[PDB]
Amino acid sequence: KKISQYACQRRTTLNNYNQLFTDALDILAENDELRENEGSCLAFMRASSVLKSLPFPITSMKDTEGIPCLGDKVKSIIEGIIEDGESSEAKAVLNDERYKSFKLFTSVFGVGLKTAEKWFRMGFRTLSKIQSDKSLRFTQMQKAGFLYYEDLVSCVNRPEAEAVSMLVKEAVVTFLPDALVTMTGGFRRGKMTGHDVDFLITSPEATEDEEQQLLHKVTDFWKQQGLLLYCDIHFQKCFLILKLDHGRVHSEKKGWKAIRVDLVMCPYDRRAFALLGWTGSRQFERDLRRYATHERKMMLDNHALYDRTKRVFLEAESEEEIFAHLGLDYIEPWERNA
Ligand SMILES: [Mg+2]
Ligand SMILES: [Zn+2]
Ligand SMILES: [Zn+2]
Ligand SMILES: [Zn+2]
Ligand SMILES: [Zn+2]
Ligand SMILES: [Zn+2]
Ligand SMILES: [Zn+2]
Ligand SMILES: [Zn+2]
């Protein structure tokens, strides 16, 4: 059976037989500025995505026959990796003078490409020099990023994500006893680590006002308890840093860890669309929307599914119903790691 050009028509599990190729493509897709080779970041992303779906490792150029999304530029990168196990193109990005600084600066919560670039052009190369500088001005997000750096740079693991889930559920149930709280993002796709923990909160009985007030109630409750380290409030959402007591963690192993937490509140009837959107991966979501537009003349996003031919919104109480409306075989969350 031929491999679809769409990630939403492939099953992509975390059992990647092509990590040598994918890690190089991901470096090239992530570093457009630092790159010296002709090719598009979209072409690198789609090629990395198809390779992730393969049930076998590429061991020769003949293995690439019949695989879509492998352009001439991508095939030269695959060729170079087969040749000695490394990509000269990815290696040039890794050896680029700005690369190390950009990775380092953007690893701070509140620091994006614009700020990383500003600091690099000022002559900064280390966080220690940035933090101790007397002339620099930091946003409140960056101050939290620097204060809790070590904890935030350690990625969150599953026992920690689950301990956060318990905290979220206890806070949410206090104000909305009928609320459904679902962990989304990478953890829902079977990942063992993450840079943060995402949740989708919905309530079958909440009014428009109760649902607007919930995130404010929960964050105030955490502030009173001394757990809120940072807070910033399409759907209503908040980006937080929570104080997690390691005594709440059920694992094999300061007494606390700073954890980045994202909370999304959605109306009950749109829960399936928000769940689908927040589960990801980013490439899976991109392909689902591209397939819906180009193959079905449908408009899909985190809030709804609209049929442009019938001029009607399509309702769904589950992700399964969305796939069915799209004429797609159902792809389980752990199979969406495109
Ligand atoms: Mg996440
Ligand atoms: Zn730039
Ligand atoms: Zn690009
Ligand atoms: Zn831990
Ligand atoms: Zn997130
Ligand atoms: Zn235990
Ligand atoms: Zn398009
Ligand atoms: Zn919308």
Swiss-Prot record:
Effect after changing H303A: Nearly abolishes enzyme activity
Q: In which tissues is it expressed?
A: Isoform TDT-L: Expressed in the thymus, and, at lower levels, in the bone marrow. Detected in both cycling and noncycling pro-B and pre-B cells (at protein level). Isoform TDT-S: Expressed in both cycling and noncycling pro-B, but not pre-B, cells (at protein level). Not detected in mature peripheral or germinal center B cells.
Effect noted on mutating D23A: Almost complete loss of exonuclease activity in TDT-L. Decreased transferase activity in TDT-S
Q: Where does a 2'-deoxyribonucleoside 5'-triphosphate bind?
A: G186, F187, R188, R189, G190, K191, H195, D196, V197, D198, G277, W278
**Co-factor(s):** Mg(2+)
Residues annotated as binding Mg(2+) are: D196, D198, D262
Name under which the protein is recorded: DNA nucleotidylexotransferase
Q: Which residues of the full protein are shown?
A: 148 to 510 of 510
